[PDB]
Design a protein around this ligand. Structure first.
Ligand SMILES: [Zn+2]
Ligand SMILES: [Zn+2]
Length: 251
């Protein structure tokens, strides 16, 4: 099994999983052109598309891909039913692709209907979980995003976080604005900066390591609580999470 990234727009990645026969799965294709080129260049045979949510940079390419490859099954949440989805899926359901069983996980936050797809070790989490960060709350509440990250954090340590955007460096700069003396965050920031100085991709990341350097997965850590509670006297986890996400909104 091979995991490939195809850049699109300014900072999107279209993930492609292909098996040993060249059959492939395409995740969140917002621009069909680079995907079509890679399919041709690599002799891939597209079998399915996964959509995580309805935003344009994630679904814009479906029509052209489906016209070129009429056999493609398009999986997605109810909120993409008008975006070319042919199999609506929801929490707890499974999509069988490339001989692998992908579990569907509802992760409201970025959008209300956002879903994630998991088949060990691959986690396609769209704009919910980023390396060092999480999605901006356009439609979901902070409580919902908090609960969605709790669900993703419970996945196995060897999970590969395949998120949709190259946000890692900015996410880690924010992390240092909150915990500037955390050695793990500093070390990861410097590694991510080194990659981005050479315009290299920072993904996928291993979930085990995200637990250490993603401040949005460290809501219940005493060191973060003490920082957050020195600004606002907040007593509940979802309130502290909202504080941190609001701070990042203006960073
Ligand atoms: Zn989005
Ligand atoms: Zn996006």
């Amino acid at each position: 099994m091979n995991l490939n990234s195809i850049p699109a727009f300014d900072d999107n990645y279209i993930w492609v999983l292909n098996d040993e026969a060249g059959r492939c799965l395409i995740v969140d294709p917002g621009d069909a052109e680079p995907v079509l080129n890679a399919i041709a260049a690599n002799n891939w045979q597209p079998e399915a598309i996964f959509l995580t949510h309805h935003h344009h940079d994630h679904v814009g390419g479906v029509k052209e891909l489906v016209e070129k490859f009429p056999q493609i099954v398009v999986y997605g949440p109810q909120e993409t039913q008008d975006k070319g989805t042919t199999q609506v899926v929801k929490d707890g359901e499974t999509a069988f692709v490339l001989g692998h069983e992908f579990s569907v996980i509802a992760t409201p936050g970025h959008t209300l209907g956002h879903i994630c797809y998991f088949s060990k070790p691959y986690l396609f989490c769209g704009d919910t979980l980023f390396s060092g960060g999480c999605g901006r709350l356009f439609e979901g509440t902070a409580s919902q995003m908090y609960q969605s990250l709790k669900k993703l954090s419970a996945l196995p340590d060897d999970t590969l976080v395949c998120c949709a955007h190259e946000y890692t460096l900015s996410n880690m700069k924010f992390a240092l604005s909150i915990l500037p003396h955390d050695l793990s965050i500093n070390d990861y920031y410097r590694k991510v900066k080194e990659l981005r100085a050479k315009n290299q991709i920072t993904l996928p990341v291993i979930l085990k390591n995200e637990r250490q350097i993603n401040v949005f997965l460290r809501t219940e850590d005493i060191d973060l609580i003490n920082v957050i509670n020195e600004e606002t006297l907040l007593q509940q986890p979802e309130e502290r999470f909202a504080w941190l996400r609001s701070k990042k909104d203006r960073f």
